[PDB]
Design a protein around this nucleic acid. Structure first.
Ligand code: ZN
Lengths: 18, 725, 227, 56, 83, 681, 23, 223
RNA sequence: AGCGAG
């Protein structure tokens, strides 16, 4: 008991720059 | 519907969150993935419109821990539901062993197209109606539905609007032009749905005899007519079955419904069977309510002769107690005498009770129809509890004489508590023992995969299959549905140089059993997993029919795991009753442990000389050949010798391996002295006997797979010349 | 209340499946049951009520000259479909002779009555035999059992028979939960209706609606300006 | 079970698993050689029939 | 054809579909491969033509490619060769 | 979550613990009910889990010797005169003597009628013995039942397993907002409550002066006065409310030991764990199939069943190396729509409703090197909601005790008035448990002759086989209690009512009665009572002498062709409410030693796809589904992001890789000096 | 009985015997 | 054939409950019509019930007003038994005030024009010397049961105290059918309905509104 | 440590 939006987001933002 | 399961939107939204964002972003409800994430987290109204669309034709796996058998996991089509609970179609309950009393179940989402195909085709609920264990259907009317159908299809003589052959006063006044007229009449208080009437059926195939006689050979029945002396309820029922099924015209006792659904599954496609069980569930639920089967203190009638017979038996108990007071017998003797007398008392009370109840009583109606419960429970309810187990295992010789209806007194309740608590603790431990046995079986027999269409071998075990009676008759052997069905023939059946009745290499189903029994032949050679001549895993034909499909197995079925799980799931139902006789006996057999009481077995034929030695029995088996006189002397005199056609009558010509003493036989010695075939037969025989003591139907072929995996290694005594110990 | 739209799907010329959605949370049942019962027992219709057959005074085992015995004649005449325009009972007569089959079409209907299936087999007359029968037709509503003959001496040959007055033969209804989510569990009433060829199921449903709208208009006629 | 004993024996004998069992492929997360994972069914190739290509 | 109208996840009927292959596993992979092909075609339709083709049959209202694949299998518009 | 659960947690004998046995070594012998338990332990009440018999409860009358032995009282009979000297015996002494049953024909003088009576001997043997021989008799029946089991009316008709379960779940019922006293009970409904300590009890007799919801001030008989302060909406240890409501007015005179205020589950002193609901025992359209229970929507409309579940969310601002945490409205970039709830302190304003995703206590965490603060505000977890009961604050500036480095601590109470919802569990006092399969509208439920809808329906196929028909007698007596009866003494008194005491020949409607545990309403007396029940409003007796009425199908209108067993049964809401059970996950926290998903509702977590499930999947032959259930859904660290991306953008799902947990196994084996290598060539 | 509690409701009982010792 | 058209007579047992006799209905019909009217009466008779309340010294349902013997939630629970009637659909508001000792009854509410409380004698709270109750309620027209609408759902501020509302004047509806079934077969059903409302509106109007809604609904099927 | 389902 000790601890995908941002990863998907970073790929998407690089593509958005494209 | 059978292929459907509910899903609370507060869960489906979270599960399908990955998908809803796509279907709404592309619908422009949002303008980017992150905005869609906001919509979902905000639970904004539009989602419920898109969600309902992205969920259709998207199966999900429902699971219930423990997953005892293969059916524990089933793929359902989800439909949105309000509330917070997964709606489950009641029919599948028996598959999951679930009872809506707080059970929790897990939903898993298959994503990949391969996975969704697996969910839709392999694991869908409607494609799985038959238990892999023995082919007994699981998605069949049970419990409430059984009572509904039993009320609907029974026949009470004397109900409203009977069919009477009246003359002079008026015509029969019992016939009806069509079932439409019957329902119209029954809507008003003119006809009852369990009364004998002569209907003009015009949409159901008549029984075999009526059709064969009236129409001769090929009378179609979607548009013709015929008279039927049935009950309107039965007509309503038979309209539920497919168009082609012959009219049954019986009382749907649970065994009858099992037979009906099994026939449908064997002959008709799977979709038809699923739809048929759906409609049966509907009719059963609708009619059980009107059945008025309810429980009330006025409906639990105590037998009228209870006090007198109880007093007489108590007088006999007092007599034996007086005999004990005079020393006529020991305390164990008087305990046994009291136990036996009170067992007679329980038998008598139960008989009188069953005599007294009329069939219309709700309790006897529930029990007789097979909805649930055994009769002994009703005996306890209005009768006497009988003997109560002392916690060690003995019987408290009081015994309880007060019925639960009449209300137990204090000490009798305290006595009953022993049995209750020991039952609970035994269940708790036996569940773990069963789980471990299941794990071991699964691990031994995981590699056994059907991976070849045909051995083309010629070996194969034989089956007794209704041996001839002593007077002369083919009385069916009790074990056919678990040892003869669903096999492939290794030979061709010919009777007294007669024509070949059934051909080699063909699936053996019930019609061929009836053909064989009619022919006059009992010994049959059948292909089996034991004699499979394949390298890696068994071949298809040597395995035979698959229960769940009903057809010949595929060439990828992991039949080993199916065998292990179908052998393990019955566990947690075998109560231990010295040589073990419960689950621990099955554990000993599979593990091949040496039995407790090694009843010596013969080693050679010939007459036998027996003597009651000093505290033991001396036995000398005259060898028919010049063998050594096998003599056994160290045997406890308590154990009794094997009985047979005599208790090993001095001079019997027991075979080279007949068990001499009555007890357990070591599988190792049996293998040594008789060979692998005999030891395989013995192991399957003993395990089947243990499982069948509790009335469990499991095909051997699973057990034969396990036995095959047990007998695959050989011990060497000659080193040869290649690195062999 | 989203408009309770009514749509229809013919499965045969005289058999329809109507579907009414989306109804109020629970009203689905109220509709379904009220319709079902009214359809079954609110459309007047006629059918043969009694028959007299020549030579039938004490024996009912069979009628000489015809293979079909009494039971076949009465059970088939049960199925006889007749429409009438006169309220008081009417008497029909049928006469046939010679080998062949006696059919529904042989009966001549006078003014005010008609047969909608003249070509329905009734019996087989053979051996140059003669078949003479008389029937009584009456209009009614519902399903009435055979009426016991009060006066034995009055009706020497009268054989009262069960009459299916109602022109609809089988109506059954079910409910569903159309758009449970955004509309919050409204009802979808599925009616299956099967009526004899006298009238189409559309006509039966329309007449049931007419009569029940009037019947509840009776209740409406207590406070016209009610909310 | 008896993980220590099995591991010691395998280490001494220098045994080599061939990864040809259901349980094994499950552990390492590749297709089990049962059901849809067998070579026959796992290697099915599908393309539309000639008439299907024609209709396009 | 003695069965009621299949609806939802049970249309196509499974038996009529099994007749197109030898065993259910073959059907599963057959339909799933066709579904994969449909999905790739739908995704890559944005750019120029490519070797994937279909759907042969007319898709419904926002169906999952797998359902279209199963429909095609049923209609006998496909051909599969095993390993 | 009750007073009874608190009471029964005391008086609990835990055979396991330090210096004692354990579950692994606990065989079947130590768990049974040794015949010496009679009176020194509860043979019926034990847990069902892996503790059966290891955790019992003390009997009602049991007493503890200074040596630690469990005494029981006994009455000493001296040659046929049952005396009144309650002498406490231990197990050994009780075995020495000969003890008679509690219920015996005492002839109003201490002597026995029947020549021989049921009697216990040294080793628990049960026999008959000459009456003159007997020297000891039990104080009273129900001496061999704990507090919990002693409240099950008609316990003498329930098979021991169902009684066990019912006695277990009486400790689970949630406290409602009415808590009506049960219509049928036993003598324990009062003492239990008073002993539970919830109800404020008059320390000394006096005269009430001031009554208010907050507190009661009472004038003592001699000058002085006392004020009892009341706990209102105090959280319970399991999240239930702990309301106390006064039941006295300004002018009443209170006697010493009187009950002054109700507790969470009390009703004028008696224990009120649930409600009397009008129950029918018919199988209704299958919705009550296999233990499921159907409810009228009335119970939701009138708020018969409803609990007030109070939660507790706490956050603390600490001092770190990069700076000091401080809660305030000055949150990092965020819309003004979400600071509406917060007050000037940055914590949620008292009374402001909160829902999932809302902010309770704004908090900004020193960001340091890479705003000087990032975002770390306490957001209410997923699926929760309700009003903010109260806010407690502790500040270092207030010189209050706090853990080192904690500048401030805040506790927020959010309370939800959870209604009854389908899927939730209900149960009676006989272990007749079941979930609420469907909450029908009030209209389409069966109703009696005069249009009284049944508030609940139970399946009939759970009474006989479970051997707990006690509930049927319970609901029969409950109907007799609700309607009221009057035995007609036209010719003396009816014979069946001969043993019936006075004050029971007549009773007004809703007259609460009691049927003690092992001696009580015999079958004959119950039948006679049912035979004459006063008509409710008109000359109409809904229930015949058989206890079954004529129910009108509310769904179709035509009457049910056969009668139905209707009555008034007491049922309680168990603390297994669905809103605490439901859970889904799509992408949540992952463990760090192995990248599998966490497990638990407190986190997101998944659902353990264990080994038996994997065997099921292998059995079906489904290989790809198993592969993705063990590789991409859980473990493939690269697989998860790629498959999520494919789903969101709609591309095909990629091929699974190699489970990470397998890599961890490989690394552990390598770190164990076993050269485990891999090759494919 | 009496219930010996200064404010208990008059809950009638079916008890056929007396309790020599209160709980 | 039967042509006689059905009737609707009434016997007013009291101002609240009344019986209605409908005859001569077709055989096997009375039960269906009785149940239809019963479901309509129990479900969809519009009325009015308090939808929210506000108290000066309170911010939520869980608290205690100073002085009153009954906590706030008990007060909402007592107010649930109010019976009212509105002639306007807009959310009207009414006030209630009391100081000093004594009890508070519905008769002490000052409803605005149109609305009126039909049960003055109901019991709300028992104020004492220090008691001071000031509560303002909101009433609106409606139908059936509706759960409390959240403050966040609307633009309501902290003070408002939503309460689930029960717009259903009908209290208890039953029926009986005494079929004749004479030997000659001139038979009919004489439905005897019995309606009892919670004083908010006489049963005549309740049954009339039920009939109105039913006529329109079956009119859609007719066409 | 306690509990729910089998
Ligand atoms: Zn083979």
């Amino acid at each position: 008991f000790i601890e995908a939006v941002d990863a998907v987001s970073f790929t998407l933002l690089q593509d958005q720059l494209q | 519907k059978l292929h459907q399961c509910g899903l609370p939107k507060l869960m489906a939204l979270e599960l399908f969150k990955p998908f809803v964002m796509k279907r709404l972003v592309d619908l422009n409800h949002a303008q980017n993935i992150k905005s869609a994430k906001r919509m979902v987290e905000r639970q904004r109204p539009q989602v419920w419109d898109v969600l309902e669309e992205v969920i259709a034709e998207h199966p999900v796996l429902l699971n219930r821990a423990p997953t005892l058998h293969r059916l524990g996991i089933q793929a359902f089509e989800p439909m949105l539901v309000e509330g917070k609970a997964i709606q489950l179609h009641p029919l599948v309950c028996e598959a999951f062993n679930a009872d809506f009393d707080g059970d929790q179940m897990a939903v898993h989402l298959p994503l990949s197209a391969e996975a969704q195909a697996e969910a839709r085709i392999l694991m869908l609920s409607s494609n799985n109606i038959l238990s892999p264990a023995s082919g007994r259907p699981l998605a069949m009317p049970r419990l409430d539905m059984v009572t509904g159908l039993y009320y609907l299809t029974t026949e009470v003589p004397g109900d409203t609007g009977e069919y009477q052959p009246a003359s002079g006063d008026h015509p029969e006044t019992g016939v009806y032009s069509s079932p439409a007229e019957a329902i119209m009449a029954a809507d008003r208080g003119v006809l009852s749905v369990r009364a004998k009437i002569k209907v003009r059926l015009t949409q159901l195939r008549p029984p075999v005899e009526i059709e064969a006689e009236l129409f001769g050979h090929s009378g179609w029945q979607p548009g013709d007519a015929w008279m039927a002396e049935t009950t309107l309820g039965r007509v309503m029922f038979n309209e539920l079955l497919p168009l082609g099924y012959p009219f049954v015209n019986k009382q749907m006792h649970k065994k009858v419904q099992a037979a009906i659904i099994n026939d449908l599954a064997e002959r008709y496609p799977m979709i038809v069977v699923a739809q048929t069980v759906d409609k049966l569930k509907d009719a059963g639920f609708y009619w059980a309510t009107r059945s008025g089967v309810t429980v009330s203190m006025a409906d639990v009638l105590v037998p009228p002769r209870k006090k007198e017979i109880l007093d007489h038996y108590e007088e006999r108990a007092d007599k034996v107690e007086k005999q004990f007071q005079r020393g006529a017998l020991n305390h164990d003797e008087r305990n046994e005498a009291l136990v036996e007398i009170w067992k007679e008392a329980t038998d008598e009370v139960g008989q009188a009770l069953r005599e007294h109840y009329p069939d219309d009583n709700p309790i006897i109606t529930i029990v007789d129809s097979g909805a649930t419960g055994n009769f002994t429970q009703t005996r306890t309810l209005a009768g006497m509890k009988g003997l109560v187990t002392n916690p060690k295992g003995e019987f408290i010789p009081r015994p309880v004489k007060s019925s639960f209806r009449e209300g137990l007194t204090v000490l009798e309740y305290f006595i009953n508590t022993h049995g209750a608590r020991k039952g609970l603790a035994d269940t708790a431990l036996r569940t773990a023992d069963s789980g471990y046995l299941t794990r071991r079986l699964v691990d031994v027999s995981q590699d056994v995969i059907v991976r070849e269409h045909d051995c083309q071998t010629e070996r194969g075990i034989v089956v007794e299959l209704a041996e001839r009676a002593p007077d002369g008759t083919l009385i069916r052997d009790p074990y056919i549905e678990t040892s003869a069905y669903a096999r492939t023939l290794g030979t061709d059946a010919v009777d007294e140089a007669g024509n070949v009745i059934v051909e080699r290499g063909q699936d053996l189903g019930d019609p061929e059993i009836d053909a064989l029994l009619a022919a006059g032949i009992t010994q049959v050679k059948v292909r089996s997993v034991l004699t499979c001549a394949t390298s890696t895993g068994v071949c298809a034909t040597c395995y035979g029919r698959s229960m769940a499909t009903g057809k010949l197995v595929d060439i990828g079925e992991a039949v080993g795991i199916v065998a292990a799980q179908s052998i393990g799931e019955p566990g947690t139902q075998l109560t231990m009753r010295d040589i073990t006789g419960g689950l621990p006996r099955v554990q000993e057999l599979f593990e091949a442990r040496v039995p407790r009481g090694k009843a010596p077995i013969a080693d050679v034929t010939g007459r036998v000389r027996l003597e009651d030695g000093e505290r033991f029995y001396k036995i000398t088996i005259v060898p028919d050949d010049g063998g050594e006189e096998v003599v056994y002397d160290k045997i406890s005199k308590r154990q009794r010798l094997r009985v047979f056609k005599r208790v090993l009558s001095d001079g019997d010509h027991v075979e080279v391996g007949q068990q001499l003493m009555e007890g357990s036989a070591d599988p190792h010695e049996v293998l040594r002295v008789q060979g692998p075939r005999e030891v395989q037969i013995h192991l399957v025989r003993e395990v089947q006997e243990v499982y069948r003591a509790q009335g469990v139907s499991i095909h051997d072929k699973h057990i034969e797979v396990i036995v095959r995996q047990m007998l695959r290694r050989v011990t060497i005594i000659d080193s040869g010349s290649t690195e062999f110990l | 209340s989203q408009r309770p739209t009514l749509s229809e799907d013919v499965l045969t010329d005289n058999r329809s499946q109507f579907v009414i959605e989306p109804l109020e949370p629970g009203f689905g049942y109220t509709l379904g049951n009220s319709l079902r019962r009214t359809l079954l027992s609110s459309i007047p219709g006629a059918a043969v009520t009694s028959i007299r057959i020549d030579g039938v005074l004490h024996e009912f085992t069979t009628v000489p000259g015809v293979k079909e015995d009494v039971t076949e004649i009465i059970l088939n005449l049960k199925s006889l479909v007749v429409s009438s325009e006169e309220d008081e009972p009417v008497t029909m007569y049928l006469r046939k002779q010679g080998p062949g089959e006696v059919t529904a079409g042989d009966i001549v209907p006078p003014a005010g009555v008609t047969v909608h299936n003249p070509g329905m087999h009734i019996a087989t007359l053979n051996d140059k035999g003669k078949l003479e029968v008389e029937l009584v037709v009456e209009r009614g509503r519902g399903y009435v059992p055979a009426v016991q003959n009060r006066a034995s001496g009055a009706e020497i040959g009268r054989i009262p028979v069960d009459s299916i007055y109602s022109p609809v033969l089988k109506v059954t209804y079910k409910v569903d939960a159309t758009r449970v989510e955004q509309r919050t569990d409204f009802d979808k009433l599925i009616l299956d209706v099967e009526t004899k060829n006298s009238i189409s199921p559309r006509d039966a449903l329309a007449s049931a609606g007419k009569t029940l709208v009037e019947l509840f208009g009776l209740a409406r006629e207590l406070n016209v300006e009610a909310e | 079970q008896e993980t220590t004993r099995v591991l010691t024996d395998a280490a001494i004998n220098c045994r080599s698993d061939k990864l040809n069992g259901l349980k094994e492929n499950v552990i390492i997360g590749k297709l089990i050689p049962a059901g849809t994972g067998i070579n026959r069914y796992r290697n099915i190739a599908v393309q539309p029939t000639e008439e299907a290509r024609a209709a396009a | 054809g003695g069965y009621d109208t299949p609806l939802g996840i049970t249309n196509p009927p499974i038996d009529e579909l099994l007749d197109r292959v030898s065993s259910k596993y073959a059907l599963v992979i057959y339909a799933a491969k066709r579904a994969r092909q449909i999905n790739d075609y739908y995704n890559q339709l944005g750019e120029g033509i490519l070797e994937y083709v279909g759907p042969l049959v007319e898709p419904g209202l926002q169906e999952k490619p797998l359902s279209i694949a199963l429909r095609e299998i049923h209609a006998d518009l496909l051909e599969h060769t095993e390993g | 979550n009750n007073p009874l659960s608190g009471l029964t947690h005391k008086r609990r004998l835990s055979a396991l613990g330090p210096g004692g046995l354990s579950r692994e070594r606990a065989g079947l012998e130590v768990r049974d009910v040794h015949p010496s338990h009679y009176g020194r332990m509860c043979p019926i009440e034990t847990p069902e889990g892996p503790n059966i018999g290891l955790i019992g409860s003390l009997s009602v009358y049991a007493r503890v010797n200074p040596f630690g032995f469990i005494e029981t009282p006994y009455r000493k009979v001296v040659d046929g005169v049952v005396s009144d000297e309650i002498v406490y015996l231990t197990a050994d002494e009780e075995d020495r003597h000969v003890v008679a049953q509690a219920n015996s024909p005492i002839d109003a003088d201490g002597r026995f009628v029947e020549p021989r009576v049921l009697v216990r001997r040294k080793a628990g043997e049960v026999e008959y013995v000459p009456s003159s021989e007997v020297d000891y008799m039990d104080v009273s029946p129900r001496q061999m039942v704990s507090v919990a089991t002693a409240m099950i009316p008609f316990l003498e008709h329930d098979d021991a397993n169902r009684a066990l379960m019912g006695a277990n779940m009486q400790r689970q019922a949630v406290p409602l907002v009415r808590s009506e006293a049960p219509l049928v009970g036993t003598g324990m409904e009062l003492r239990a409550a008073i002993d539970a300590g919830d109800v404020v009890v008059a320390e000394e007799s006096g005269v009430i002066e001031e009554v208010s919801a907050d507190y009661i001030t009472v004038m003592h008989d001699n000058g002085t006065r006392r004020t009892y302060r009341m706990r209102k909406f105090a959280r319970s240890n399991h999240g239930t409310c702990a309301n106390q409501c006064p039941i006295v007015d300004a002018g009443d005179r209170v006697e010493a030991g009187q009950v002054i205020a109700d507790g969470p589950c009390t009703d004028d002193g008696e224990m009120a764990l649930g409600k009397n609901l009008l129950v029918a025992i018919m199988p209704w359209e299958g919705h009550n199939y296999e233990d499921a229970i159907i409810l009228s929507n009335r119970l939701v409309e009138e708020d018969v069943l409803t609990s007030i579940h109070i939660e507790e969310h706490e956050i603390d601002a600490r001092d770190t190396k990069l700076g000091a945490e401080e809660i305030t409205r000055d949150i990092p970039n965020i819309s003004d729509e979400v600071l509406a709830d917060l007050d000037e302190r940055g914590i949620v304003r008292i009374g402001a409703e909160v829902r999932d995703g809302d902010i309770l206590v704004g908090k900004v965490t020193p960001k340091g090197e890479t705003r000087e603060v990032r975002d770390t505000s306490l957001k209410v977890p997923h699926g929760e909601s309700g009003k903010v009961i109260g806010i407690r604050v502790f500040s270092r500036e207030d010189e209050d005790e706090l853990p080192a480095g904690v500048n401030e601590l805040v506790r927020v109470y959010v309370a939800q008035k959870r209604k009854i919802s389908d899927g939730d569990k209900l149960a009676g006092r006989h272990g007749n448990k079941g979930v609420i399969g469907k909450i029908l509208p009030v209209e389409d439920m069966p109703f009696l002759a005069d249009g009284t809808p049944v508030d609940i329906i139970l399946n009939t196929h759970g009474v006989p086989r479970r051997m707990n028909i006690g509930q049927i007698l319970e609901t029969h007596l409950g109907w007799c209690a609700h309607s009221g009866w009057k035995v007609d003494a036209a010719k003396g008194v009816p014979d069946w009512a001969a043993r019936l005491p006075d004050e029971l020949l007549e009773a007004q409607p809703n007259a609460i009665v009691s049927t003690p545990v092992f001696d009580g309403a015999q079958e004959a007396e119950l039948q006679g009572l049912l035979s004459c029940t006063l008509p409710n409003r008109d000359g109409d007796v809904l229930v015949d002498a058989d206890g079954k009425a004529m129910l009108f199908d509310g769904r179709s209108g035509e009457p049910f062709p056969y009668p139905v067993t209707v009555g008034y049964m007491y049922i309680m809401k168990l603390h297994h409410l669905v809103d605490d059970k439901i859970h889904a996950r799509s992408t949540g926290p992952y463990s760090m030693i192995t990248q599998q998903p966490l497990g638990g509702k407190a986190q997101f977590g998944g659902q353990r796809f264990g080994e038996m499930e994997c065997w099921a999947m292998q059995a079906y032959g489904a290989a790809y589904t198993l592969q993705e259930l063990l590789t991409i859904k859980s473990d493939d660290t690269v697989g998860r992001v790629k498959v999520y991306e494919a789903i969101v953008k709609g591309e095909n799902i990629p091929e699974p890789g190699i489970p990470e947990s397998f890599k961890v196994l490989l690394k552990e084996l390598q770190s164990l000096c076993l050269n485990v290598e891999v090759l494919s060539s | 009985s009496n219930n010996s509690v200064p404010g208990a409701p008059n809950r009638v009982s079916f008890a056929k015997l007396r309790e020599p010792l209160e709980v």
